[PDB]
Amino acid sequence: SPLEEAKRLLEKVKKRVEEIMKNPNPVKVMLELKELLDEAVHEFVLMEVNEENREVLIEILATIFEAFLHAARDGGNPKLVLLLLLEAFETFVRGVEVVGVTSERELRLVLELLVEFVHVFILISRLLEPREFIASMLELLRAIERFFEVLKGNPERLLAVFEEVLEDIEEAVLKKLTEVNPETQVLLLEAFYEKKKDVVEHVRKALF
Amino acid sequence: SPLEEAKRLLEKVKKRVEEIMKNPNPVKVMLELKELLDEAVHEFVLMEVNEENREVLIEILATIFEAFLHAARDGGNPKLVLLLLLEAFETFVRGVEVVGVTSERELRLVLELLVEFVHVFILISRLLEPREFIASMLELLRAIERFFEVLKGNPERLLAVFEEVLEDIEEAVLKKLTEVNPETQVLLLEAFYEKKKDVVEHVRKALF
Amino acid sequence: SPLEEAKRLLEKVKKRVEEIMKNPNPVKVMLELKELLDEAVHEFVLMEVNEENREVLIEILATIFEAFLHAARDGGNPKLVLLLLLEAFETFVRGVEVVGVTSERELRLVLELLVEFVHVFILISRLLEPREFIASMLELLRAIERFFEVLKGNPERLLAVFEEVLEDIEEAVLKKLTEVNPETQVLLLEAFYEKKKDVVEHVRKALF
Amino acid sequence: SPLEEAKRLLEKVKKRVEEIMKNPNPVKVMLELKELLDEAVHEFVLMEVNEENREVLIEILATIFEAFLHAARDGGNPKLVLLLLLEAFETFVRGVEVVGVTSERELRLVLELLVEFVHVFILISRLLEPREFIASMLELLRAIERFFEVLKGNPERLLAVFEEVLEDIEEAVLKKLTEVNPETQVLLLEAFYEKKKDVVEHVRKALF
Amino acid sequence: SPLEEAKRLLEKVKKRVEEIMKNPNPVKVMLELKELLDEAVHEFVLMEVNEENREVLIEILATIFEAFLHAARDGGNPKLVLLLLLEAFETFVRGVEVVGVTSERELRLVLELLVEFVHVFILISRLLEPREFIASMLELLRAIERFFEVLKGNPERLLAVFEEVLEDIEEAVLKKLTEVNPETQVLLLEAFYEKKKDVVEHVRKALF
Amino acid sequence: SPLEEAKRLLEKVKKRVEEIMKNPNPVKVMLELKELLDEAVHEFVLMEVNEENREVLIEILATIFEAFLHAARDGGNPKLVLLLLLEAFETFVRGVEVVGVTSERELRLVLELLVEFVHVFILISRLLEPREFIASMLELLRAIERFFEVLKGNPERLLAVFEEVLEDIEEAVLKKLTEVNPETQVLLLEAFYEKKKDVVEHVRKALF
Amino acid sequence: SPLEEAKRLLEKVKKRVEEIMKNPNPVKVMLELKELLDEAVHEFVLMEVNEENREVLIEILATIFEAFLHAARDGGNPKLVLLLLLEAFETFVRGVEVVGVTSERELRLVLELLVEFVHVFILISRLLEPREFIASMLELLRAIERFFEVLKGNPERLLAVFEEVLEDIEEAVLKKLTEVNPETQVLLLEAFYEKKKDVVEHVRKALF
């Protein structure tokens, strides 16, 4: 039965996550969580996904990704942490694509996860230099564009969420760019705004 | 149900505000309240906003903003406090734009919040030097212009409130500018009056 | 046909400007307007400019530059705004050089734009400190000298306009320099007057 | 034994204070006294505080703080002295919070120390300019509010002491504000009275 | 016999520390002390640790760590010294975990060592730039969290010590962050307070 | 023939200078003029310098250096312009050393060039901050010392010129240093006067 | 014979110093003098140092170090010059340790050299920023501590010289630290005074 096997997988994943978080090393915890997410996706593609077990699969993905976001908040080297965050987000997007999102609860869960991911990413990247900060923000913009192209649902709510996270990123960039000379400010602002306009056009094309 | 979830959110926000206000550090309190306001806006864009729960959402926003205004009155470094006040006001305006204001009670709530915000801003900026004071007043004028462009309602009452807060700012500026030489007075008065004329034109275009 | 393509470009530019000015962020509006001005110059150098379509090209340049000047008056960080104003003015001067000014109406349009630019520059730079203010005035003097070297027309009217804008700058500098000690006044006045004498010599050589 | 260790600590602290006060540099003396106060608090949180050794710990704190207040009266740069006084007062309040006040002798000791601190602060800040004077008075009001929120005891005596020190500060502010124009007087008086009303409300809430 | 071997190890370690401290090069002294600490831990895991020799092992660890802290105060390159301090602290925490802390004297010894370590770390990091200073403070927060997770004892005294060292770090950060613009202050304060809240939650979970 | 080749070089250099000066970019003009001066020195060391063509070579150097000084007065970034000015002066000194100065006309020419260089340097560096201003003045003192060590001629006239340019620098420094606190004034004045005494002693040793 | 070889070495070193000092480049002169000092130390360790040739070796060291101090006063990049000054001082201390100081004349010579070194170091470091200035002062304190640990002689005169140079450094630091905010002043003063107390303790241990 699909539902029973999905529930067994959920219990196994919960036990594995609880075991993993006990480690004191944050980078090791992130690596094990990334491996667990990949195994969950591999299990997803090897099983039938009907309308009964979809909620359980979404809950498994949410559990692993929430643990990963907390472990990222725990700390480490910012560049490595940001790279691992991007890899985990790509795996999560692939998993959501495989499973699919139908009901409103799953949409709410994945959107809350996206908001938390953006917040954690900005919090980690606060401590870089302005040029590396702008490069990281460009990478985050690409990731958000990919996520919103994959996801399907009500266009209006998705557009509202997209605009809100974009405002968050814009506020962070504007606050950070006050540490440099006006010429560097103009250069970096032009780069950021060109990328933002492009991703807005792409997302508006995909949603509507 | 929208109404039940909105009431649950209101109770949670009230509990969080009571917990936060107990801290003795005003800057930490302000930062936590700013984070809470952002989280409230995130929750707002993730749920349906019909005519039943709109009052509850406006009440949540008013609660958080009142707590923030009191914490700003508590004290700290004036420049940091003023910048945090501007950021909180921008988040509040975004939340009001998302929720929308329909009835008279919500309009009354947001207008009293604006009046209190202007009073607190002037009170905090009283202690700067004249040039930084005029720069802060220019920032406040831009914020008020943004607020009155976003808001919708009866044009006459909105115009009356706008004129009253403008008179408040003008009186504060006139009283402060008596500490400098007449040439500096002429320069700063010219800057302030040019900005005031521009914002009056913009607001009158937007309202009517 | 050159005239039809010029009119189509005028309509497209008007539509783009109207779309851009709806944004609430003044710095983003300025960046988009600068990009549009550069695109207009690119279009100008790629097409034939005879005596028929010259007026339309001058009107396109005037439209974009008027929108930029208003957006600059809207507000922002003074140093960044002044830097963007200088970049826009250089792009405008290059466009005028490419197109050329023959009739009296085009000369009137460009001279009015120059007067508005000087007024906006002084208004924005009012809020700096005296040393940065004097540096900004030096930059403005170099920009005005370049503009009057590029332009061709009746020497007497051009000299009258140049003298009037110089008097405006001198009045602003004299009013601002009353906030410092007499020794700093002597230093900054010496720097300003040396630069003014040099630019007067250069402009008088170029015009006659 | 707690009592014997507390008495040994008192003897060591007395010897250290006598050794430190022999230095001719007042700022260095203040820095060493701050370090000694921090070390005393560290010792306090690392040992048991019963009803036997509480008096000895209170006398240790009083000894260090009295030495600091005399050194602050000795002289130096007023802004640096005021900042060091505020830091020392906050450390003293933390130490009192850790130890606690039960008997009447300890209450009398700490209240006398607060009165001397307010007197020294007003004496040092007499020589600033009126705007910086009002800023320092606001900082002093916040410090007094924190002290009276931390302390526990008889509400009536505490309220009497609070009202008396408030009257002292008000008299100092009124006497100082006669050196400026009436408009500056109105602005600074409004700021001071708003802050005083807020702190009175907070203290009356905390005491009763 | 365990006790005799422990005392022989103590004498050998004392002789080695005295021999090492005679070197004039601070970085070389720190490296030799780190090697000696690692050797002591290796010896600890190779012998039986009962309730008789535990005090001697704790005294050996305290001796080596006190020598290391003094050598770190001696001087050198701030980044290298801070990195070596973190490595030595991790080795010390592992040694304390291996040996264990049972009586009150050992707890007092290790807590005094922690206070000294925090003071030395702040003193060394005073000379960095604000961004590197905040990064160092985050690393220190992680180190303190790991220490208080490893240690076992009376929850109340441990919590008091933890709160006091947190207040020390907070005062240092607040004093340092006055050298930057308010936007940078907001960014860095948000990062610091997020990390502080996370470590407070983790420590409160571990202790209770 | 040496004289004919020198005259041909003079004509070529005049043509090149006229061609270069037409550029509107001052920094590019300065870079080309520096390259031209270097090429002139290369040509000087590659040809015979008798008493016939010495005047022509001195005139070539004076032509290029006058063009460079005017281009420096035109404007740009003060730090870049000052550094380019120092390099150009060092190249000019090397050229004068290679060619040599024998008659009175050449001495008058080079001394007038030195006076103009000092005036332009002070004019450009008027707009820096006091610490960078004093650093630039120290660099100028080293350059003047090197120039007066290389040059040969009548000791009395050279000493008079050296004293006059020193008085100009001293007046500029004294007038600038009124914008800082008396402690900073004492520090910067001590540095400047130590350097001035050293260069005076060196120049008096070299001349006599 | 030791004395004849020492005198021959003195003559050779005098000739080499006279040849080197003729160079116009200060950094090249300083590097050459550093190499010469190293070669002198190499020669010192390769020959017998009895009581007859000790004076000549001390005179050789004094000659090279005086030339180096003058070259450092000549000028250059402050950071590079300070680093070269520290390296030269360390080589000089090694040479003094190898040769040894017995009579009163040698002690007077080396102490005069130390006073001149401290004066030159403070003069060069006057022009840095306050944070880099304090870092340089910390490095100078370590250098002085090493010097006074190596030297042997009458404890009272050595202590008097040490106290006097410490007062010179303290006066310089106090004068410089008036250019920053009181919080930065407190941080930097705490760092400086901690280091000064540590070096005073070390020197008092070494001398007595």
Ligand SMILES: [Zn+2]
């Ligand atoms: Zn965590």
Ligand SMILES: [Zn+2]
């Ligand atoms: Zn957000």
Ligand SMILES: [Zn+2]
């Ligand atoms: Zn309050």
Ligand SMILES: [Zn+2]
């Ligand atoms: Zn009002």
Ligand SMILES: [Zn+2]
């Ligand atoms: Zn406008």
Ligand SMILES: [Zn+2]
């Ligand atoms: Zn005008």
Ligand SMILES: [Zn+2]
């Ligand atoms: Zn006294």
Ligand SMILES: [Zn+2]
């Ligand atoms: Zn009183």
Ligand SMILES: [Zn+2]
């Ligand atoms: Zn030490």
Ligand SMILES: [Zn+2]
């Ligand atoms: Zn402490």
Ligand SMILES: [Zn+2]
């Ligand atoms: Zn020129």
Ligand SMILES: [Zn+2]
């Ligand atoms: Zn002159």
Ligand SMILES: [Zn+2]
């Ligand atoms: Zn010299």
Ligand SMILES: [Zn+2]
């Ligand atoms: Zn001295």
